[PDB]
């Protein structure tokens, strides 16, 4: 590829170890998961940190209000739940369906009373690209595995957008956030592109992601032009090799516990 993001990828792909963990979290922001950690390996219920250093992530979104979650949620992809337990947290949302692959070698939901944690219906073992859309108010999706390659990165990519298309078919009034794991390949802004025609929205990038990622999040609640958002963005991590500073570290994001009602 000839973009300024397959310029990083092979900069990426080329650094040593050292290098690479030299780089991945330089002037990146981190979510002290000691704590998280020490209670999950405990199996503890009883806590409302966040289950993975994606609900960091949703939150800096929704407190921007480059998403703002009400009515039914869905969570495509959920994981260990971090989506869907911020989800459940906010007094605006009625109900999540959260739906995973999971099982051995992918993570599996955990089982937590972060708050509005009996408003999440998860259903594990669960393929979402072949599963029909239904009734949303609010479609999230966190998909998009990483891989050297950025032709295979391009493609999860790609997949991600068609299944969005389904859902706003679905739903056409529904917001959407969903992850692109590799928006500076052609057939990737191509797809946004004729989403953001039909739909709306815009990409913005979390500063919890680490360099050594390009993801960027599509939101139908902003605006903005695409390929110059991609193209930033690659300049941005291109100029973070040889970034002497370290991770910026803040404290993780904590629910509370508790059930909620209707
Ligand atoms: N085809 C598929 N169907 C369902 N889940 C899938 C999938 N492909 C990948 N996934 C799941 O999508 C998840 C995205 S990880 C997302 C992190 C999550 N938002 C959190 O905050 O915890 C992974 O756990 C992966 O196993």
């Known amino acids: 590829g000839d973009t300024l993001g397959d310029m990083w990828k092979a900069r990426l792909n080329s650094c040593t170890k050292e290098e690479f963990f030299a ?4 002037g990146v922001m981190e979510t002290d998961r ?3 950690r020490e209670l999950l390996k405990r199996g503890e219920t009883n806590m409302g940190l966040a289950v993975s250093r994606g609900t960091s992530k949703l939150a800096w979104m929704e407190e921007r209000g480059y998403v703002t979650l009400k009515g039914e949620v869905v969570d495509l992809g959920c994981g260990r739940g971090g989506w869907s337990y911020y989800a459940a947290s906010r007094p605006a949302v009625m109900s999540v369906r959260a739906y995973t692959i999971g099982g051995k070698g992918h993570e599996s939901p955990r089982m937590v009373t972060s708050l509005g944690w009996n408003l999440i219906k998860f259903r594990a073992g669960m393929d979402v690209f072949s599963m029909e859309p239904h009734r949303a108010d609010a479609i999230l999706c966190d998909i998009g595995e990483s891989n050297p390659d950025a032709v295979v990165e391009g493609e999860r990519s790609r997949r991600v957008i068609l299944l969005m298309e389904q859902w706003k078919n679905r739903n056409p009034t529904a917001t959407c956030v969903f992850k692109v794991l590799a928006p500076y390949r052609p057939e990737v802004i191509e797809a946004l592109h004729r989403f953001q025609l039909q739909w709306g929205g815009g990409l913005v990038r979390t500063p919890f992601s680490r360099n050594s990622t390009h993801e960027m999040y599509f939101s139908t609640a902003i605006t903005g032009n695409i390929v110059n958002s991609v193209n930033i963005q690659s300049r941005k991590l291109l ?6 500073r370290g991770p910026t570290r803040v404290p993780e994001i904590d629910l509370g516990v508790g059930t909620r009602c209707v």
């Not at 100029?239 to 002497?244: I, S, V």
């Open 239 to 244: 100029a973070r090799f040889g970034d002497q």
């Open 34 to 36: 000691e704590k998280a």
């Open 23 to 26: 780089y991945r979290r330089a």
